[PDB]
Amino acid sequence: DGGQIKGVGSGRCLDVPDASTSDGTQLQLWDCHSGTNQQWAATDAGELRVYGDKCLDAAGTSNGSKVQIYSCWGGDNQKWRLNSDGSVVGVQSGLCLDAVGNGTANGTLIQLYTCSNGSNQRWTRT
Numbered sequence: 001d002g003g004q005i006k007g008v009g010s011g012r013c014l015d016v017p018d019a020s021t022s023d024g025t026q027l028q029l030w031d032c033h034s035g036t037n038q039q040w041a042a043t044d045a046g047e048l049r050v051y052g053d054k055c056l057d058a059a060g061t062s063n064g065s066k067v068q069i070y071s072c073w074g075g076d077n078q079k080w081r082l083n084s085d086g087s088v089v090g091v092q093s094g095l096c097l098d099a100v101g102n103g104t105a106n107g108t109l110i111q112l113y114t115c116s117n118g119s120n121q122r123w124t125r126t
């Protein structure tokens with residue numbers, strides 16, 4: 001089924017750059033559209049999957065750690081808890097999906113950051 005993951009503060013969607021499938025590609029915000037690189041499926045294993053086999057993936061547990069796509073493998077850094085307030089928390093890190101520098105424009109990067117009430121850490125949809 002899928003579903004976009006749209007940033008509240010930016011009104012832009014969680015987007016895989018160029019619809020790349022390459023391990024390590026950092027996530028960005030982009031104007032929402034119908035493509036597969038903006039479709040995210042939540043799984044029972046706690047994942048946010050794109051293209052079927054790729055996972056939203058935290059490269060570390062520290063502030064400013066890159067959020068990237070990576071081949072799904074079962075790691076806890078590929079597990080996320082989408083809260084009731086729209087925060088997306090990394091299970092391994094206890095840090096939140098965060099649009100870097102409170103950025104809102106196309107191309108602003110996504111990272112892990114200390115959970116706050118910033119609108120750059122709030123996301124809607126499935």
Ligand SMILES: O[C@@H]1[C@@H](O)[C@H](O[C@@H]2CO[C@@H](O[C@@H]3CO[C@@H](O[C@@H]4CO[C@@H](O[C@@H]5CO[C@@H](O)[C@H](O)[C@H]5O)[C@H](O)[C@H]4O)[C@H](O)[C@H]3O)[C@H](O)[C@H]2O)OC[C@H]1O
Pocket residue numbers: 023024057058059060066068070073075077
């Ligand atoms: O030297 C340092 C750099 O390494 C660092 O770069 C970042 C390192 O982290 C990168 O992201 C993580 C990469 O590792 C992933 O976990 C892997 C997934 O693959 C598993 O192996 C598979 C096992 O099954 C086999 O059949 C198959 O062949 C294998 O693929 C492996 O066991 C796991 O460890 C994590 O999910 C990622 O988070 C990140 O992209 C880099 O930027 O930067 C600092 C530098 O000093």
